[PDB]
Amino acid sequence: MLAVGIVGLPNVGKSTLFNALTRANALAANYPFATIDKNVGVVPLEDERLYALQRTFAKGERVPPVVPTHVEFVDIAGLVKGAHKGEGLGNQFLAHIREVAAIAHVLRCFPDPLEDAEVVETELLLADLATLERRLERLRKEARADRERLPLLEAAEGLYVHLQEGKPARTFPPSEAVARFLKETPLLTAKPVIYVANVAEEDLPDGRGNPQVEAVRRKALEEGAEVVVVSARLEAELAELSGEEARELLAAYGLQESGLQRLARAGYRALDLLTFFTAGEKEVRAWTVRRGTKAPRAAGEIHSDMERGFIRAEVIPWDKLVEAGGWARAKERGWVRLEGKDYEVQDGDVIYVLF
């Protein structure tokens, strides 16, 4: 699942954060099928570029509607710390973690958070060490018969040293061999991690001077995780209001973006995603693809057909389309590019597929 799994030990504010997330999910324009699950929802991603494009294509009294994209979050369910005696405690949690692309761990930083982080990390490490032991045995046999498997075996040898020292796969230095191994065997500790420091509202936006948040930032550096500071209670309260009123009251408190939006943006980065747009008089919409996605696959997101039927596409940075004043005007300015099947989409690109 192209989603962020939210985890938390008892009483850290996770259910409160999910009251907010479930409310936000009821605002979505399009729902991924996975959201049928009560534990899966999305947070619409606010993007001012949509409104900028909207003004560019508004004519007379007509204004095209805007459709934002979103980031999917899963409430990871399950007891975390098992006995490892074959009884099965903790198995459901691991199974759920396997299905998400990134992990966001809620840590309580208001009346030890590092202890919670280590508890979860320890269970993920134990599962990964077992996976590595199984792969080392299998790969060593396969490599003797097919040298093409050797790089994965050598990457696994290195990761095993790293994990045996209690370090996550995500902080192991990158290399071609490690990349091939992790694509085939997606270790739990290789998933990007966001530590969500839950604080009292007075500590927003960065938990400055809050020793618990500072300790979380220190641990994050060691674990290769990013940090987002939110007040779950505040987010739940704001989510009950209209977006306009919530923004005004937030600004009155000297805060410029909700914690849910900050979390959504952190999740977007963790999942290595980028936004591209389709824009015209009828509609302006934001689409999401993984960084590295080429024009054809991008086109496939808009219309399945277009991927195979893809011949070429007009592409222009949203800011240049806005600066020009429209498609006809951007063409005249020579700012509209015709890109082929080899083109890697860039964040902010506006695309119109030919055929």
Ligand SMILES: Nc1nc2c(ncn2[C@@H]2O[C@H](COP(=O)(O)OP(=O)(O)O)[C@@H](O)[C@H]2O)c(=O)[nH]1
């Ligand atoms: N002051 C304050 N209290 C919070 C915040 N988030 C959660 N709480 C309170 O902390 C307790 C546990 O929150 P909860 O969502 O039930 O934790 P869970 O066990 O991780 O779901 C509750 O009584 C919540 O009201 C927050 O951001 N600020």
